[model samples]
Target chain A: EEKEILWNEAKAFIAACYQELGKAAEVKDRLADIKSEIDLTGSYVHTKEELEHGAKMAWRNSNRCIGRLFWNSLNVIDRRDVRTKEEVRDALFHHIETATNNGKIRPTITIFPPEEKGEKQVEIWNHQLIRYAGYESDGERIGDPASCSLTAACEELGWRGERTDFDLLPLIFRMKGDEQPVWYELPRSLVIEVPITHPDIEAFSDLELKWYGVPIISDMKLEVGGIHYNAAPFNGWYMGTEIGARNLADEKRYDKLKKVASVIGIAADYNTDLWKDQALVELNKAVLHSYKKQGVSIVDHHTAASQFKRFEEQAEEAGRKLTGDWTWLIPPISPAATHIFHRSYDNSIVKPNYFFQDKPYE
Target chain B: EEKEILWNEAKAFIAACYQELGKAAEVKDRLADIKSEIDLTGSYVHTKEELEHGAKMAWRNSNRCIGRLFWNSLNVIDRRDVRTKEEVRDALFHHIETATNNGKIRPTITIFPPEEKGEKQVEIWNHQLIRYAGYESDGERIGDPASCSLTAACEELGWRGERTDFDLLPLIFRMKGDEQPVWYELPRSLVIEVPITHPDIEAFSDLELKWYGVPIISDMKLEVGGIHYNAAPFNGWYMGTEIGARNLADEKRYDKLKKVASVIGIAADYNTDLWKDQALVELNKAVLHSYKKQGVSIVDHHTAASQFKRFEEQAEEAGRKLTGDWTWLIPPISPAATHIFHRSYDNSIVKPNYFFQDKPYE
Candidate 1:
């Protein structure tokens, strides 16, 4: 009995030592895993695929604290700067350029093939030339004519001149006048999402489409000198002027957009109470309709900029109150798929102010 | 010559086949990686670690849209109710329990060790239980009895037991506060880290000491509720109240605390702006602080929550203006983090009222 007890004690002692060793090993391994995750995230700064992946990850992870930090940093750029298609494209290019320089890779492009019977069959190509330079040592990719082929490819892909369309590239462009002149391009990275059911949500949804901003269409009629006319499709709502497309060129872009929206068959008019309600319904359907618990979060440049600005102001205030000092804030972005349109996959570059409203500080 | 030509064609064909395969493989790998990243994001949930990590990456990548979603989420929680210590402890417990249940093994604990001179010897002893718990599981080596022993050890080691500082046993107290008060004795599947800073940091850097909120005896001026008493040893700009002690006991605790505080003679109050300014400078002494970029940010929660509320109100008002629909706000805590008191590290019972502060919606 004495011998057995002694042996068991020895076994327990050995086990205890092994357990401690195992824990030490685990700590090392966990640190390594954390380092790798950091590296993977860091490497994404230059690659399209990795950067987009990282962006999507970020959007989902956003909570109040991190979100505030993210919002404040973005206050550096003016939202009004991104106006026309070319401007929006330019902003996207700049962001991509900077990201690539930082060692992030470009994400692969997957085009939604045309479904109409008479649609043109354009080759679905990705910008490999831009990616190639990113891989080279001391290789500067942007400003190279070859790397700018994304725009050319988009033009070839039947993307008429830029107008707001979800399918064309979920973008917000600022217009200089009624003629929809280009201003500047907003960075795709600036965009963030709020759920349709969110308290601050402003959107509309229906069986045929999903529309963000205002739940229902309002009766704000178009008028000139006592003459009343129906408001243009793009007027009054967020980015409506550039996206509603009253003119032929704009109309063409809108038509293309309708095709894509039709696939989901969910629609909303942002001018009414139905906007948020319907958007919520549409989001639910996209999740339930697709038999998945997760749904995609979409944001236009205007919404992104506004949301980020708001976040920055709040986070800064909190930091100041808590610490009573000026501290830099880093807001967290949500995890969602993000895509920036560079000249509509065509060669034309747009400035920023064409689509977004101006923020005084920006 | 014919044979040679055939061989060349065969080689070319094989090379072409391999190239095609390689492209396909690359595409497959990229797609798989995307899926893995997407799945890891947990986008459906509010703020998982992976999702948060993704947001961090996005903010790092964009440098524009910082706290977008994160700021709003925090406002959703912070603006409503003031969280109590018990609530905070429950929050921490839930966090640990959930992580453990999910098979996550990484656990970090931050302890506010009481400062004293000869008390340092006892302080080391006080931490032994937590340190041992780091190595031993609840059921086997450090059972419920041992947890109970740990609780006693804490009191014996000189902790003010007024707060729910012993609430760390959620693993065994799965029934939310129903576990024995001594749940630390139960077998748990997690590790414990005491006094998060390493010994080296504690010994060499004043930055770590200040950041950890240690009080300074030399800078203290004793005061009554609304009047100044005199310069006292343990009455500087110290935050937090140590209740549940008699006047004599309070003086004793204070004296002991003062001795420890004076041992590390760096006297900048963390709660003060002057201290924060000094901290920023001292923080640079450590490389880790550099990695966090001195923790500077532009946003604050107060501003973020207010803006989000404004947006919510605007959207709701817009909805009302358009369609006269009353859109109710969602409860902010629905997606908020489970906050807990660091004091509750030795018990298993949970009370939402103890740590959770839910806001009353209008």
Candidate 2:
């Protein structure tokens, strides 16, 4: 059956899915804004002299040695029969975990001529991790909220090996001591996004999914993990102190808290589309200013937002296949809670019209 | 009275200043090198990418903002009088001091409106004398070198009544604790480089200096103060835990250092022309390939290891000035002292053939 797709509706749908996935709808909104800002900044084109100067300064400020990791990941998946962004996105998202560990089948990228000796030796390679989406139902769901784990698909395709020996890659996960507060007593897997490798595409075809030109290797990687704690039925005031202290230190925390709460709203009340519409409107404005700043005339900023929404639906469907219910958090399982408590509380307080439920540990 | 103006005797003239001022010969040599390096680096246009890249990268990396207090002196100095490199060199070479507190001045440049901020509101300014430049004298020859107070020519300009109604001019200086480190400590008695304001030149002058154009703001105030310490005689296994360390568990120390002495032979020690020539050669090479990758060329690499001569005249001059007599210790103060000490100590021997000293504590 063909699912009828609505541009704005798609965004609402994906945003709702992301909320269930433990992210606030605001994150979806913010991601749209961030992308739009990048587009608007005209970083790709040297438009204004000041803008060019700013971009150059920013680029110079960044660690460019890491860029090779993403470039290698794209090359790894380039030979596959991928077509749609979803097919490629799903197949490429799971490799993140494989790339971060020291296991024999470590899915990692090695930049030639490591930072030592300053020599142009071809055999010298600096190794780094790859990251994609999916496989961490208990952890932070990285990549597009609605996207699939193309990274895992890559591993299945015979691309899951160390770049040096080219052996089958193993699924490796690591959790830091601070992150796993109780890990010493109870050790558990902490999934993360790692860099992509060529073998990942072969795994994608093995999963019988169409691929694209080359998996786009991003010069960026996000380290994500999950935490589980009994959500005691409290007003979360102490959580407020934790949140407030962080917010006091950084202004961005306030916004991030608000977004996380919106996600909690969808999980508790089951209305995922509510905040999604609001986010799209904000995104439209960002796209307009950004495009205009780049000396480009865009008729509709809604186009990208609409594409984003459609992508979300596809991700949710894939996620549901991996996890039985849309809501993945169990009572004992503590998700990597950034500011969700405050967000959940705020949603319950101001938006009393929305549904609220208290799930306490027995 | 025609002050006997000598011609074609740059070195002699500079030496005469040292002699008349009752300074040692080493002071003459250091001053010469300082003047030469400053002139060469500022005047030459760099061309090579790697050299330029290194310089630019290092410039960006430097915490030079710590030195902005010197700006006031730069502002007071008039550019018209700087018709030649010597004039410019002398202008910058003047000792910077905080007269109010008798402290040495440290200067830095600050440009604001970071790249993240839009270009709407941007400001560039200088703040100097944020810290003291610690110095040392020939061990015991002079009184505590750190106690010497500085009185820059710039401080003698820019003096007004207690009213703080002042213009925001380009060059300014200030003591670290001073309200306006660049302006408050400046004295009003000296000759200034430019008039306070001009209708046509005000804005353009500020803009032009950014592109290597000189704006005459002579004799701007410079406040200097500081106590220098003698590095020698304060020696031999200086073993002590850092102040904050709690106990032996936390404290770390290195002990039982063997003495490695040094008193290298030089052909012409503290020769102003020789030092200047050596420094100029390196400074010029640095300027020539200031942007080149091959790095600095050593011209007077062996200027050391010749029969030591210049020190007697210098020591006699020091005595004549009523400065203290030079004393000796196992380790001499030089950039390579650490390496020399380590090598000599490692080989279980006292090597005195590597010592070289110059630069007077002010």
Candidate 3:
């Protein structure tokens, strides 16, 4: 069971974590235990408290996330004891249901087994816990273009989708000892989707638009105290601009600005009228209105900016330097109107954070 | 007259400038002459051709400027021999008149005397050659909030404005060996202001909005071949977003979004309606529409993005590594719709460029 691990990194993370958690007196004793354990097995297990707080700190360290004001409110579900692929699958569905929270989405994370002896025991291929499938039509994509590769992997495994514009893809993941990846269709009751509509524009409601309630990122490696939670999946409530300004309005995704503009009685031209810009705002308004009407939790970009301001203040009060990726932190819509747009940020990386991992299928 | 100058910078600039101008053969001879001149008096005079091409290169190297597609087409005026600030004032008037082009605004820069013995010979106090005066009005700004400081300086010099929303401020500048700064009221015939109107919205015109037709940046030092032309004022035709998205819509500048929202019949709220965003597009539309109607030269953000893309490709074809300030290059309105927002840039600054100088009034 012995394997090499960087003692320097582990010691540093342990010192910071325990000190911040007000267990400073226990740090010297804990380090002695871990140091001996690493000498024997070159590994150490994190207790439930360490796992929970580490995940919370990871959320706090997520530079791109604007809803970081609720970092400490994260509900960390430790599924480290799961022994089979089926167990992992069930836990993810549970993650979905628990995080969905009947549309008042809770920021939740389910961390599966950690890397043992520098080997990944589990891996999730899907980018999110619940993202729509993308299938090729005769001349166009039928769903989210971002999911085409993963959707293809599912189809290759004999998993099928309805080919609808908002068809949810099955969860596809694998355990290391298993020869093949497993695909499981989520329970319909657990997967909540909000049908998009506009308050005043009747035509907007007829656009056949719908988006999944929660954004549960599934692929990123959760790193804490030199431990890699290889199968960690996390969720947060949607920011209105993510659905409207990017997912729907981006040229490569839904590219629905022209349709939305047409419904709003504006010519979708790059002319002096800025029809695309106008259409973008209307589409954004539709998301906020529809999400609220559906009893789903979502924050508009402007409100989210104000919330981020509070997050900044809290970070200041805690005497921690608030680091951020300015490009990602700034809302995609009406960026100038937000205080975030007026500020500059250092994009320095902090530990106890989620990190990109290579695609297992790739 | 002898003073130490960084010969390394001087040589590098001379090599690049001469080579780019297809006059590579003259570089060696020019370097020898400048070296001898430096040995004698630490100064070298640029011929008319050198001044013209140097200014063009400066424009090309301006990382923050989006309109650099026309860098080679810059109209560089030589006024290196002006003996008095009065003569300098007359030349500036000529620059404004010629560059304004009665709405067909030109990309123009007038290079005054280069710094002698590392001492600035002339300075312009105005941030721009043409900007409105701002005055306090019962706890509110009557004009542009951006111009409050400069307006106060102009008023201190006994220069008066009509106290209207678009009243033009007088020019304040100084020459070396002069005890007092000179103030000059621009000739009305030489200045152009376009009345803002919307294409389809009638109430937008009722807001009585107007903006200057030209943007002549007057305060940046034009550095070329180790020489600083401290009085080099340059102009580029307005990019529509500059006026509508920033100068008018910014909270600290004109802060007109609420008023514009009210005129557009949207509640001026940061609610899910995104009234400010809608109002921003409308305000932008008004600028483009009014400028086109009034026969002014203005490019919308979308068109400017396309132009910048072309500039990028041309830079690639010329085997030039393009450097840019991503924060400044991205348009303030509907930024994600443009390719610049999706791109990353190295903000490493190059030489033979315009640099900020401290405000003389400060």
Candidate 4:
């Protein structure tokens, strides 16, 4: 029953792709081959066109993606032949360089080999390819709390970082069942970070806030046509809130608001809203201002919402239902102010799609 | 088919409530009556115990509720006897005055009449019983954008507001078949408000920011064992971000961040993160400080998260699977700091529960 369901889903997806791409003649041959493969081996392979369209479709079907307006613009690099850890690291670095595009970020994805019935697939351990490290001391964490576990794991693997807020962790990956894994430090030349500063507040510059240019989620599995690409890493440009509202301002992350609030002359109990609200707004503003000043491609929630509205309209015009997870599509800050919050959505998970994979470490 | 499904759902909910409340002996008797009523009248009535338990269960089943720690503490006022607009207006005012409790806010709910085969149910048009007015003039809105529609409707009913940022909107409601609705202005003595002020920033008090103490959501339907109560208004104490981060900071609402940012010497241009973040933090601080100074009950996101973690533990000990809507449970600010964000939840809507009702006006 499971095999039959998977085959039906794969066939339906491929048929829809062919119709969407206006290649009616190719559907029959592709459908026949998929059926035979599924019947013989319980799974089917994807064609190059299928892979490209599938990856784009996965982004389109991502319920949590507020940036789906640029779904079709993604650059898909098929590295399905790569097996060695060194090749994987090189491809990832290449992904970073190309997607970074010197701050003109391009949404991109790189797909590695898929897991077959009897074979293991390559897996990445880090949540994101580029993240700061956290160090444990006597009673305090010195860096990002989000990275503490990964930092500890890296240390166990004999990797060392400066324990600074801006220190980037190395890529840790291995083929399934391998006794050991390989780690590679991200090339400094390819990594671009913007320093956060406020124009009016001179003291704000002293805080030394900064964030990486690209947000490449590396740990999710990309399932296409019943085949699971366990090492599919994807990138999208930073939405200001992801850095300002979340990364820097979130208590478990950088928790910079208290210091910021005090510096800016805001006082009230920590339980009070005055200090936190003021700090959050300024942090978001600095991120937006800094990114724009650097000529980097970043979007504010307002602009992103408008773009998403346009995407919704386009989808409606194209006779398609825009399926989304309303909770995620709505920005974390001031959610009700966005058009996304005023409506409901069907959050049905469609394939080919991205799925959260088990953490390789724990 | 839809009616049958709804009937079955209502029956199952009542049965579950009975079982959970240790009234298992009464389930069979009550369930039999529900089936007979559905077969004869296409709907059923909830017993008094079912009503109380269902109301409590609705609070428990609220996925977005961070306030669920006090789920059992809710005062369920059985106003099922109310039918007239006058009665509803009176009951609502009563709810506001009692729930306000002179700043010692109480979690409360008032359930009105349910839909039946031949009777029309009462419905409230306003999103909240207590909200500010918004007047649209040319390219500008004088008050809260969220209240523009209701404000226009109030005007149609010959109700006049001062068109100020903090003008409280009157409650508008009607029986389902009534040709006209009634509007009742909430008395000042019944409403409690806090004047916002920042502790360290002396100029912050000059902003003249203030907000009502009570938040009574008036337009959701209460469903218990499939029967739909079209008029169920609920209230809980403020979570600072709901006011500071959203109502005041959101661009489309009060949009106060820019003004606060400027007053605090934040620079323009979207490039710098300094101004907005600083302003937002101060604004939130003022809200928190003001509320606490006024002895009004409120909670910061951090405290709320910690409380919710305890709620989860208690639920686990009671052998109940804590279902939640992760998107709602995670605080808007510093979501990762909360244990809620790291976990996955079964977001399946269970009953007895509250649901969004259709707007009476477009």
Rank order by TM-score, top first? Answer: 3, 4, 1, 2
Off by over 4 Å in 3: A1-5, A136-139, B1-5, B136-138
Looking at the true structure's interface, with contacts defined as alpha carbon pairs within 8 Å between chains A and B, what fraction does model 1 recover? 0.00
| Model 4 lDDT tens row, A1-362 | 85787787787887888988998788898888878888888887777888999999999889898888988988999998886777888899999999989889989999998887636578788899988898877997788888888888888899998878788999998777786677888889989889998756778888888898889999998888777887889999888889987889776788898888876666747544444555666677778878888888888887788889998998999998889987678776645546787688899988879999777675
Candidate 1, overall lDDT? 0.24
Q: How many clashing residue pairs, candidate 1?
A: 160
DockQ of 4: 0.31
Task: Give the C-alpha miss distance for residue B141 in model 2, angstroms.
Answer: 23
Q: Which candidate do you rate higher for lDDT, 1 or 2? A: 1
- Indicate which candidate wins on TM-score: 3
> Which segments of candidate 2 are over 4 A away from where they belong?
A1-63, A66-75, A84-86, A100-190, A193-362, B1-66, B73-101, B104-362
Model 1, which residues run further than 4 Å from truth? A1-362, B1-191, B198-362
Model 2 per-residue lDDT tens digits across residues A35-113:
4543454211111322222222222222211111111122111112333333322333333333323221232321111
Task: List pairs with backbone clashes in candidate 3.
Answer: none
Give lDDT: candidate 1, residue B180: 20
Which prediction has the highest lDDT against the true structure? 3
DockQ of each: 0.01, 0.00, 0.81, 0.31
| Candidate 4: Cα lDDT at B81 | 91
Give lDDT tens digits, candidate 2, residues B1-362.
11111111223333443453455465555445645543554211111321222222222222211111121222121222223333323333242221111211122211111111112111111222211112224542211112122222223344322211122222333222233323333232221111111122232222111000011112211110010101110000010111001011110111101100001111223221122122212222222221112121111111110111232234355452211111111111110111111121112211111112222212
TM-score of 3: 0.97
